[PDB]
Amino acid sequence: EAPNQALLRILKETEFKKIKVLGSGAFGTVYKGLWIPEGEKVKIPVAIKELRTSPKANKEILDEAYVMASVDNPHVCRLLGICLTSTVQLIMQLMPFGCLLDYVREHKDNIGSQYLLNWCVQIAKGMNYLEDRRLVHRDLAARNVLVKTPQHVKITDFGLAKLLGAEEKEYHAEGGKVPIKWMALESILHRIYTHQSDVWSYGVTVWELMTFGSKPYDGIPASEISSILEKGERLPQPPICTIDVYMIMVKCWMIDADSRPKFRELIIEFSKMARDPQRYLVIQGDMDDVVDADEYLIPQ
Numbered sequence: 001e002a003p004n005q006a007l008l009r010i011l012k013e014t015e016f017k018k019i020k021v022l023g024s025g026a027f028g029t030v031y032k033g034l035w036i037p038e039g040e041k042v043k044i045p046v047a048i049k050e051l052r053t054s055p056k057a058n059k060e061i062l063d064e065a066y067v068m069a070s071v072d073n074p075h076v077c078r079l080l081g082i083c084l085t086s087t088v089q090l091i092m093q094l095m096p097f098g099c100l101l102d103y104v105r106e107h108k109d110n111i112g113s114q115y116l117l118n119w120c121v122q123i124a125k126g127m128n129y130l131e132d133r134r135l136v137h138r139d140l141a142a143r144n145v146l147v148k149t150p151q152h153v154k155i156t157d158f159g160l161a162k163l164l165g166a167e168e169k170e171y172h173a174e175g176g177k178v179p180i181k182w183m184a185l186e187s188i189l190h191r192i193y194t195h196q197s198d199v200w201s202y203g204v205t206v207w208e209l210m211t212f213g214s215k216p217y218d219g220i221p222a223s224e225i226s227s228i229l230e231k232g233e234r235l236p237q238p239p240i241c242t243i244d245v246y247m248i249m250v251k252c253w254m255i256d257a258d259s260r261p262k263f264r265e266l267i268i269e270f271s272k273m274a275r276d277p278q279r280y281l282v283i284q285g286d287m288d289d290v291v292d293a294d295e296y297l298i299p300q
């Protein structure tokens with residue numbers, strides 16, 4: 001493609017303060033914390049990831065940081081910098097309310113059509129931006145969208161995201177453990193991932209939400225998923241979903257990838273629906289100097 005002039009920032013440990021922990025194991029510890037640039041007279045809420053040395057882990061995380069640095073959008077969670085302590089740390093924008101998946105679950109009784117539809121839009125928007133940056137997320141899930149505010153969600157955790165090389169339209173992945181129930185078929189069959197691979201995962205993500213955090217193909221062993229999809233079976237229609245919404249989800253689960261909708265179409269469609277939420281989704285009755293990361297832009 002063109003030169004990637006993303007800026008990568010290196011930060012001092014003394015520059016940021018850990019306040020508490022928001023989950024830890026299986027990776028390392030993610031801390032709530034605050035980062036204060038040296039002269040700036042501002043304090044920025046952040047999430048700090050300190051790796052659980054093992055060279056392998058440092059490699060992985062730096063790759064994560066490489067990806068985040070290479071993206072700037074309102075709808076993609078922002079990466080502030082990295083710290084080269086003994087244990088490498090990744091500083092990123094803090095989304096106070098946690099993953100959307102857990103969020104929808106804890107609040108079924110309060111999420112309304114407006115909230116849901118808007119979210120669908122915000123993610124389509126976020127994702128479409130990654131399409132622009134020639135990026136294949138490869139692990140789009142409700143668990144990987146985090147909530148900045150109830151009105152604002154952002155995509156994050158690019159554990160498996162990959163940036164397409166130039167004149168490269170598919171990514172072929174060596175075997176590893178991967179989200180199965182979220183994956184497109186081609187991805188399962190041929191370990192091929194594309195943006196339209198990402199769309200299917202988008203369609204599932206919406207289903208994840210419209211069921212208020214249900215588990216797709218619950219019970220069904222991941223081993224048997226490919227047969228089913230090959231058979232033409234798909235996820236069921238959520239109770240609250242008008243035909244319109246669900247139809248949209250289904251088109252994401254078509255076998256022919258160019259058959260699936262592009263993200264821009266998804267944005268445009270959900271936006272019209274979000275104009276009139278209650279018609280498209282049916283629900284049972286409807287710190288002094290702190291600056292958000294989005295509002296902060298680096299010196300020079």
Ligand SMILES: */C=C/C(=O)N1CC[C@@H](Oc2nc(Nc3ccc(N4CCC(N5CCN(C)CC5)CC4)cc3)c(C(N)=O)nc2CC)C1
Pocket residue numbers: 022023024030047049092093094095096097098099100101102143144146157
């Ligand atoms: C789906 C969860 C998931 O995938 N995890 C695993 C580790 C986490 O990571 C990150 N976490 C965050 N931020 C973050 C902020 C806030 C919270 N909690 C969740 C629980 C909630 N309550 C606890 C108290 N109860 C009484 C009510 C519910 C408070 C908010 C969890 C996570 C971030 C980030 N950028 O903010 N980033 C990561 C990735 C490193 C996500």
